Amino acid sequence: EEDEEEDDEFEEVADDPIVMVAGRPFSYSEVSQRPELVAQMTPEEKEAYIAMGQRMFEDLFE
Amino acid sequence: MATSSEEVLLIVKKVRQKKQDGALYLMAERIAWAPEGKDRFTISHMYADIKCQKISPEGKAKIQLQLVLHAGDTTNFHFSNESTAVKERDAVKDLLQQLLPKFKRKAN
């Protein structure tokens, strides 16, 4: 029994949901970083983006 | 594999958990891995207890995927599928990262 695992190069992944904008699948951090995306996102997509955020927002408070 | 009939996301094989060759199963609400041909998974974590992730990018010959749970446990899946390892890791990582918020429960 040995260990070939070292952990010398790992991208700290972040739980990021997918929010579609204009029918195009973008990530949450992607949609939030692009004001044009939310500006070209439909009410449904905006509400979806907002709702998806509330899910993560409800997982804070600490 | 749950009796509740969950939406299996991705079935990865040749997934070595600490030199243990098995498969990484991303299920609807839980990520479970099992070796070779097993019915009962060896490692079962729920997207609700997972805090964040860590993954070996393209600078790694060994395709690994670390899961940082809220419990204070981090498991690194060593994918060895010479043909899909990277993509299966990236896939799992993708699905993992995207599906996390669905069950994400900050218990730490």
CA-based nearest residue in chain B for residue A29: B98
Substitution target from B64, B86, B89, B96 for chain A, most A beta carbons within 10 A: B64
DSSP string for A29-46: HHHHH-HHHHHHS-HHHH
Q: Which domains does chain B have, with CATH numbers?
A: 1-108 (2.30.29.30)
Amino acid type, B9: L
CA-based nearest residue in chain B for residue A28: B98
Report which of A22, A36, A34, A31 is spatially closest to residue A50, judged by C-alpha positions. Answer: A31
Q: Please list every residue in chain B whose beta carbon sits closer than 8 Å to the beta carbon of residue A17.
A: 98, 100-102
Exposed (0-12), middle (13-18) or buried (19+): which is A27, by Cβ within 10 Å?
A: middle
Using the Cβ of B76 and the Cβ atoms of chain A, whether some distance falls under 8 Å is answered with: yes
CA-based nearest residue in chain B for residue A6: B76
Cβ atoms < 10 Å from Cβ of A26:
20
The DSSP H or E segment spanning B21 is strand B21-26
What was the experiment behind these coordinates?
A: NMR
Contacts of the segment A49-58: beta carbons below 8 A, 24+ positions apart: A49/A19, A49/A21, A52/A17, A52/A19, A52/A28, A52/B101, A53/A28, A55/A17, A55/B101, A55/B102, A55/B104, A56/A15, A56/A17, A56/A28, A56/B101, A56/B104
Q: Is the dihedral of CA A41, A42, A43, A49 positive or negative?
A: negative
Report domain extents, chain A.
1-62
Structure tokens at B69: 């749970």
Please state, in angstroms and rounded to a whole number, the distance separating the CA atoms of residues B32 and B24.
Answer: 6
